[PDB]
Ligand code: MET
C-alpha cells in the first residue's frame with residue numbers, strides 16, 4: 001500500500017441559506033483567540049446540542065468507512081447529517097478550507113481534504129467533524145479501520161483511543177491542565193510511540209479555536225488550572241514513526257516524512273463542578 005497523493009476535489013457542497021454561518025465563512029481569518037475560557041450556562045447547554053450533532057455526523061460517516069469508499073463520500077455523509085440537523089459544518093470555509101470535515105488516512109497526521117482518494121483494505125481513516133449550531137461549536141474525531149488492518153495498526157488505533165480516554169478521565173476542577181499531556185505522553189511512550197507536539201487541543205465555545213491551548217505531551221511549565229465551565233478539546237495525534245512532517249501543496253494536509261502511520265481521537269470536554277462531561281458523546 002503506497003504513500004497517498006491527492007485526488008480530485010468535488011465542488012463546494014451547498015448549505016441551505018437558513019443555517020447560520022460562522023462569522024469567518026468567506027474570510028481569510030477568523031475572529032477568535034481572545035474568548036473566555038469558562039463558558040456561560042447558556043453556552044454550555046448549546047454546546048451539548050452542538051456536541052451531540054457532531055458526534056452523530058462522525059458516527060454516520062464512520063459507518064461508511066470501507067474498502068472502495070472515497071474520502072469525498074465520507075464528507076458527503078457528514079455534511080448531509082450536519083445540514084439535516086440544522087448545523088453548519090464549521091470547517092467549511094474556515095481559513096479557506098474547502099470541505100465539511102477532515103479525512104486523514106494512514107500517514108496523514110491531520111487535516112486531510114476529502115477527495116477522490118479511494119480507501120483500500122487495511123487502511124486507517126480518521127474523520128474529524130465540527131458542528132456549528134446555536135452560535136457554538138462541537139468538535140470530535142475518531143480513527144476507523146478499513147477491512148483487514150494489520151495488528152500494528154489496530155494496536156496504534158486502540159492505544160490512541162485509550163490515551164484519549166485516560167486523559168479525559170483526569171479532567172476535574174483544580175487540576176493542572178498539564179496533567180492531560182503527561183498522561184497521554186506517558187501512555188504513548190509505554191508502547192514506543194511518539195506524540196505529535198506541534199498540533200494541540202484547544203478551547204472551543206462560541207469560537208472554534210478560542211485561544212486556550214491544550215498540549216498532548218508533558219510540559220509542566222504550563223500553569224493553567226482547570227475551572228468549572230471551561231470547555232476544550234483533547235485530540236492527541238500519535239505516531240509510529242518520527243515526528244517530522246511535511247504539508248502538501250493544498251496548504252492543509254500534514255503527512256509524516258517517514259510515511260509511517262498515525263492515529264488520532266478527539267472529544268470536546270466540559271469541566272464540571274466536580275469532574276468532566278464529554279459533550280461529544282453519543
Ligand atoms: C480544517 S480545520 C479542522 C480543525 C479540527 N476539527 C480541530 O479539531 O481543530
Ligand SMILES: [Co+2]
Pocket residue numbers: 128129130139140141266
Ligand atoms: Co476536530
Ligand SMILES: [Co+2]
Pocket residue numbers: 139140201202233235266
Ligand atoms: Co479540535
Ligand code: NA
Pocket residue numbers: 104105106107108109110126261262263
Ligand atoms: Na494518520
